[PDB]
Amino acid sequence: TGVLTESNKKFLPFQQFGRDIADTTDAVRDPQTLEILDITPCSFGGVSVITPGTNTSNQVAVLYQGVNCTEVNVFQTRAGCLIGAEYVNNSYECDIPIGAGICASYQSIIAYTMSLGAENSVAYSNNSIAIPTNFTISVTTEILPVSMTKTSVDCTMYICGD
Amino acid sequence: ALGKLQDVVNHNAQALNTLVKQLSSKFGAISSVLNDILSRLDPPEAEVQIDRLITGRLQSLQTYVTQQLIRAAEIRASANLAATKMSECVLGQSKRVDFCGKGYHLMSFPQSAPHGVVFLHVTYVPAQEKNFTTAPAICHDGKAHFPREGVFVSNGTHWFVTQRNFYEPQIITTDNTFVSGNCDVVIGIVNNTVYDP
Amino acid sequence: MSLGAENSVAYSNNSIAIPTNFTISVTTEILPVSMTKTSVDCTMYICGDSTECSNLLLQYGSFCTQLKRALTGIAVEQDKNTQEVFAQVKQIYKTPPIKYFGGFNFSQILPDPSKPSKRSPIEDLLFNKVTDLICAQKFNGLTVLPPLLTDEMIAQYTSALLAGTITSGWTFGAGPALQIPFPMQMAYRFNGIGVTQNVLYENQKLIANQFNSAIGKIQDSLSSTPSALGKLQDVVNHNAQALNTLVKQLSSKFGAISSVLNDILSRLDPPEAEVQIDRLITGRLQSLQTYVTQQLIRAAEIRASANLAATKMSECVLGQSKRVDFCGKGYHLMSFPQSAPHGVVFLHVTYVPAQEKNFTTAPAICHDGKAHFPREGVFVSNGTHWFVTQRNFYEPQIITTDNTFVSGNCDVVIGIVNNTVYDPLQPELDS
Ligand SMILES: *[C@@H]1O[C@H](CO)[C@@H](O[C@@H]2O[C@H](CO)[C@@H](O)[C@H](O)[C@H]2NC(C)=O)[C@H](O)[C@H]1NC(C)=O
Ligand SMILES: *[C@@H]1O[C@H](CO)[C@@H](O[C@@H]2O[C@H](CO)[C@@H](O)[C@H](O)[C@H]2NC(C)=O)[C@H](O)[C@H]1NC(C)=O
Ligand SMILES: *[C@@H]1O[C@H](CO)[C@@H](O[C@@H]2O[C@H](CO)[C@@H](O)[C@H](O)[C@H]2NC(C)=O)[C@H](O)[C@H]1NC(C)=O
Ligand SMILES: *[C@@H]1O[C@H](CO)[C@@H](O[C@@H]2O[C@H](CO)[C@@H](O)[C@H](O)[C@H]2NC(C)=O)[C@H](O)[C@H]1NC(C)=O
Ligand SMILES: *[C@@H]1O[C@H](CO)[C@@H](O[C@@H]2O[C@H](CO)[C@@H](O)[C@H](O)[C@H]2NC(C)=O)[C@H](O)[C@H]1NC(C)=O
Ligand SMILES: *[C@@H]1O[C@H](CO)[C@@H](O[C@@H]2O[C@H](CO)[C@@H](O)[C@H](O)[C@H]2NC(C)=O)[C@H](O)[C@H]1NC(C)=O
Ligand SMILES: *[C@@H]1O[C@H](CO)[C@@H](O[C@@H]2O[C@H](CO)[C@@H](O)[C@H](O)[C@H]2NC(C)=O)[C@H](O)[C@H]1NC(C)=O
Ligand SMILES: *[C@@H]1O[C@H](CO)[C@@H](O[C@@H]2O[C@H](CO)[C@@H](O)[C@H](O)[C@H]2NC(C)=O)[C@H](O)[C@H]1NC(C)=O
Numbered sequence: 001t002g003v004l005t006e007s008n009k010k011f012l013p014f015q016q017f018g019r020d021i022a023d024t025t026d027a028v029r030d031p032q033t034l035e036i037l038d039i040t041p042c043s044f045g046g047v048s049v050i051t052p053g054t055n056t057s058n059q060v061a062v063l064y065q066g067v068n069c070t071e072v073n074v075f076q077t078r079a080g081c082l083i084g085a086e087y088v089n090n091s092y093e094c095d096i097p098i099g100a101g102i103c104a105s106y107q108s109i110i111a112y113t114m115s116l117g118a119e120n121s122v123a124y125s126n127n128s129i130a131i132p133t134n135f136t137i138s139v140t141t142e143i144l145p146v147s148m149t150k151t152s153v154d155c156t157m158y159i160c161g162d
Numbered sequence: 163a164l165g166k167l168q169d170v171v172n173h174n175a176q177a178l179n180t181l182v183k184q185l186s187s188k189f190g191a192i193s194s195v196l197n198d199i200l201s202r203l204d205p206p207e208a209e210v211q212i213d214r215l216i217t218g219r220l221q222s223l224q225t226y227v228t229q230q231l232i233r234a235a236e237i238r239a240s241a242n243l244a245a246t247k248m249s250e251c252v253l254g255q256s257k258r259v260d261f262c263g264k265g266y267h268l269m270s271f272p273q274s275a276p277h278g279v280v281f282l283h284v285t286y287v288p289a290q291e292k293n294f295t296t297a298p299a300i301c302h303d304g305k306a307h308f309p310r311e312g313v314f315v316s317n318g319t320h321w322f323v324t325q326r327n328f329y330e331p332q333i334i335t336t337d338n339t340f341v342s343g344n345c346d347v348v349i350g351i352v353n354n355t356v357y358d359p
Numbered sequence: 360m361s362l363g364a365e366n367s368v369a370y371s372n373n374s375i376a377i378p379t380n381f382t383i384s385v386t387t388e389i390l391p392v393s394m395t396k397t398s399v400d401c402t403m404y405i406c407g408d409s410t411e412c413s414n415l416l417l418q419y420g421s422f423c424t425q426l427k428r429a430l431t432g433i434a435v436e437q438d439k440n441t442q443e444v445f446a447q448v449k450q451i452y453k454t455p456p457i458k459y460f461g462g463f464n465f466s467q468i469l470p471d472p473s474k475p476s477k478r479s480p481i482e483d484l485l486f487n488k489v490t491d492l493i494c495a496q497k498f499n500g501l502t503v504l505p506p507l508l509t510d511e512m513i514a515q516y517t518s519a520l521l522a523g524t525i526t527s528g529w530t531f532g533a534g535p536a537l538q539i540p541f542p543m544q545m546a547y548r549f550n551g552i553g554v555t556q557n558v559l560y561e562n563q564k565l566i567a568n569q570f571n572s573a574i575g576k577i578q579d580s581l582s583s584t585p586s587a588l589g590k591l592q593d594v595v596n597h598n599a600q601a602l603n604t605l606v607k608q609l610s611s612k613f614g615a616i617s618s619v620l621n622d623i624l625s626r627l628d629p630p631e632a633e634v635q636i637d638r639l640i641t642g643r644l645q646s647l648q649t650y651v652t653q654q655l656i657r658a659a660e661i662r663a664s665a666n667l668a669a670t671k672m673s674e675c676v677l678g679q680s681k682r683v684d685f686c687g688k689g690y691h692l693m694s695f696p697q698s699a700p701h702g703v704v705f706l707h708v709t710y711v712p713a714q715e716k717n718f719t720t721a722p723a724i725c726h727d728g729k730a731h732f733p734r735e736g737v738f739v740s741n742g743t744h745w746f747v748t749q750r751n752f753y754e755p756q757i758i759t760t761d762n763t764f765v766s767g768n769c770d771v772v773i774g775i776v777n778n779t780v781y782d783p784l785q786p787e788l789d790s
């Protein structure tokens with residue numbers, strides 16, 4: 001199953017079919033008329049559903065991965081076509097990752113380019129220094145997994161039972 | 163907050179559930195129940211059906227063991243990191259940056275958690291910074307004076323020497339400065355008096 | 360093979376070697392951070408458009424769900440690895456408009472305004488030097504997923520880290536960014552490795568020239584060597600190779616009459632077609648499981664490398680590290696992060712001692728029946744006179760009460776030599 005586009009490839013007279021580097025057909029010669037056609041498979045995409053928690057809302061957005069918007073609140077991203085989210089020029093922290101610098105959040109569902117950080121310009125000069133005059137004692141949490149559940153499998157009973 | 167430990171627990175349960183789920187798979191055989199296969203067929207074809215079930219179940223079990231081994235390696239690496247943190251953050255003060263909390267590390271406290279450890283990192287964070295005019299050295303009597311442990315700061319009219327991480331201005335003296343060379347070599351040296359005790 | 364050039368160290372009980380000069384050495388460390396994110400449609404890959412094949416595939420159970428879940432875990436893991444290595448500052452720092460840092464030149468590592476990508480010349484070189492197969496891989500139901508952080512944003516994070524380190528030293532890592540002049544920052548780093556501030560200040564122009572020359576050499580070395588960026592390219596190669604192998608596996612009969620499902624359906628009745636499709640499904644499923652297993656092992660290796668890269672970014676770039684060989688060869692001074700495709704390159708600026716000279720050494724000096732020990736240095740003799748100098752640079756100073764401390768009598772100490780110890784107070788009271 002494929003689209004048959006015009007081909008610029010010059011086949012030798014014996015050759016009938018054409019193959020990719022990976023041994024998949026990319027070209028063919030028509031039997032009725034001796035012309036070369038570029039066989040290209042029909043478009044496919046990975047449908048991804050972007051949703052907030054169900055209790056908060058039931059609105060969803062659909063991302064078609066790798067599919068241009070013209071071949072399927074519609075916005076075009078490098079990741080694919082995003083339908084059901086409205087692009088906002090504002091930048092916020094990432095809530096739901098879409099990819100290619102695009103993130104989604106619920107406020108309706110909006111898509112935006114995520115802000116890396118707040119912008120700070122340090123006042124560097126040849127002869128000025130900044131000295132702390134006070135301190136904060138900060139306690140922070142680090143959570144590390146140490147062990148897993150210990151599992152034993154009876155191979156004979158699992159495969160065969162009694 | 164405790165997502166990582168729960169995730170590990172979730173994976174183990176999920177893996178077992180998947181393995182249990184695999185028992186309900188025909189694997190290309192007439193039935194997924196061995197007892198039905200024995201009850202319904204003669205041994206020459208029952209052997210073939212049992213073989214199909216055995217190969218599918220064995221493949222499932224091998225897949226489960228392979229994922230378990232990869233997860234075991236990941237957990238072992240995490241445990242080794244946790245042991246390193248326990249030795250270096252709890253049993254000692256660490257000069258490594260960001261190893262034992264954000265900021266300058268002071269001490270750490272271990273807390274047990276299911277399948278895990280939680281480290282409470284007590285760190286010192288500088289705050290309320292103030293601008294000062296600074297110089298590399300002080301020129302007094304044709305000699306260059308450098309801070310032994312601090313930095314030279316000026317509030318606009320007077321020069322003092324203070325510790326780098328806290329503002330504590332002190333009079334510039336021979337006690338807290340050392341003399342190396344003449345003033346001319348140093349770039350940016352400023353002229354100020356150096357007190358003698 | 361020869362292990363090494365042969366050197367015999369001239370050990371003697373009373374001789375020490377003291378460096379009289381230094382070399383500022385910049386070295387490159389290349390670390391992989393992330394891999395290509397791959398997603399596989401299990402049904403499309405194994406069966407394509409065949410309904411009968413999908414129906415037979417359903418009998419095997421949740422294998423497809425397991426493979427998709429594992430790939431999804433790897434895909435999120437790569438983004439997490441990139442966040443851990445690069446997103447370590449919540450403030451995007453910027454360099455001052457006047458790029459004067461006491462004679463230190465950072466043009467090669469700072470972002471270039473002229474370039475549209477806003478990357479440094481070193482970063483641009485790194486991107487250039489790391490590079491219908493893709494179409495076929497896409498056509499077989501395998502999809503490459505874009506990285507969550509784009510290359511420009513990763514470059515922006517590296518720029519923020521560079522701006523923070525250059526303008527603020529190590530303060531920004533541990534808290535608010537506190538401005539410090541770059542020569543004073545370099546002097547602090549010199550103090551960290553045990554060399555006094557005066558050595559940096561007196562030789563500031565020489566140190567700046569050495570650093571600039573080293574940075575230029577680093578750019579030339581990366582540009583002129585094919586195998587400098589081998590590790591990142593290898594990772595890219597493995598991912599492409601794995602996909603190619605998986606695509607190649609579709610052309611395998613796997614013990615069946617044909618490798619084409621459509622031919623099997625067209626030529627055979629369903630009782631034997633089911634057997635042939637089963638053979639194809641089991642072979643393709645085994646191939647897919649094998650691919651996922653290698654991907655998981657590689658993901659673990661890349662995760663370990665990313666954890667190491669994050670540790671280097673925290674300890675070498677955001678701080679000065681006393682760990683030996685962790686942040687370059689030599690005594691570590693500072694480090695600079697540069698973005699690279701699927702990777703980070705660390706420019707480690709280190710202090711290497713050079714032009715060492717022999718001196719006669721003693722553990723202690725005996726004066727007035729008392730043993731004097733150096734507070735911070737070592738006792739050296741040039742043949743006739745005794746001086747005390749810092750261990751890592753030769754700076755002879757007169758032995759005085761100020762730089763020595765008295766513990767015990769001379770007799771207990773072994774190897775003690777007799778020399779005068781000057782008193783600062785003696786001229787003052789005398790005059
Ligand atoms: C130290 O002084 C500098 C300049 O004298 C201060 O930097 C200014 O900060 C304000 C407030 O954020 C900005 O609006 C200016 O644009 C900054 N100037 C420059 C040249 O960057 C800095 O805030 C002072 N530091 C402290 C702790 O007061
Ligand atoms: C340093 O910061 C501490 C807080 O971190 C300041 O303590 C506060 O002082 C104000 C006014 O004196 C009180 O209203 C607060 O209740 C205090 N907070 C705490 C936690 O004690 C302290 O005054 C600051 N010191 C300087 C010199 O600025
Ligand atoms: C810089 O700090 C010094 C020391 O604190 C200041 O000198 C003192 O200033 C106070 C108030 O102006 C006077 O009462 C003292 O008599 C001063 N001491 C001496 C020894 O003169 C100085 O004023 C500060 N400069 C600025 C611009 O704030
Ligand atoms: C720091 O002090 C030195 C010596 O007191 C100053 O050097 C003198 O400068 C004046 C005016 O430029 C000359 O007339 C003298 O001949 C200089 N003497 C010597 C020994 O060089 C120097 O100018 C001072 N620097 C500052 C910034 O005030
Ligand atoms: C310090 O002195 C020792 C010995 O006085 C020197 O070691 C000699 O080095 C030369 C040249 O490499 C060799 O031919 C000798 O055999 C070495 N002698 C011994 C006893 O090992 C050493 O080179 C001197 N250090 C410096 C920096 O010149
Ligand atoms: C320390 O080494 C530096 C070079 O690493 C020396 O600087 C060189 O000095 C010579 C003669 O003065 C010049 O011809 C070179 O061009 C200098 N090189 C550089 C890179 O500036 C310096 O002289 C040495 N110092 C000592 C005390 O040995
Ligand atoms: C910093 O280094 C850069 C390059 O490392 C210097 O730029 C060079 O400037 C010279 C003189 O104008 C040109 O001939 C070169 O073509 C420049 N190189 C590049 C790569 O553009 C720069 O002058 C140095 N100094 C400062 C203050 O930026
Ligand atoms: C060891 O170092 C001392 C001090 O640098 C040298 O003593 C000086 O030597 C020079 C040249 O011989 C004389 O002009 C000075 O007057 C000496 N100073 C004193 C205080 O005597 C000494 O010569 C060096 N010894 C050797 C063997 O090089």
Ligand SMILES: *[C@@H]1O[C@H](CO)[C@@H](O[C@@H]2O[C@H](CO)[C@@H](O)[C@H](O)[C@H]2NC(C)=O)[C@H](O)[C@H]1NC(C)=O
Pocket residue numbers: 725776777
């Ligand atoms: C170091 O100095 C001490 C004290 O001046 C020396 O001890 C003296 O040695 C002489 C000759 O052996 C004796 O006549 C004195 O009676 C000793 N005095 C004491 C208090 O013991 C010692 O010999 C010197 N050591 C060296 C290696 O020169």
Ligand SMILES: *[C@@H]1O[C@H](CO)[C@@H](O)[C@H](O)[C@H]1NC(C)=O
Pocket residue numbers: 031032033034
């Ligand atoms: C077949 O028919 C087409 C259409 O009439 C003609 O153009 C062509 O020359 C014929 N012969 C071959 C060998 O294709």
Ligand SMILES: *[C@@H]1O[C@H](CO)[C@@H](O)[C@H](O)[C@H]1NC(C)=O
Pocket residue numbers: 124125126455457459
């Ligand atoms: C000091 O800094 C300013 C801007 O930061 C610069 O214009 C000036 O040239 C610097 N001074 C010297 C002596 O380089």
Ligand SMILES: *[C@@H]1O[C@H](CO)[C@@H](O)[C@H](O)[C@H]1NC(C)=O
Pocket residue numbers: 370371372
């Ligand atoms: C000093 O070293 C030499 C050989 O290096 C050795 O023979 C001698 O015994 C040593 N001196 C003492 C007092 O042990």
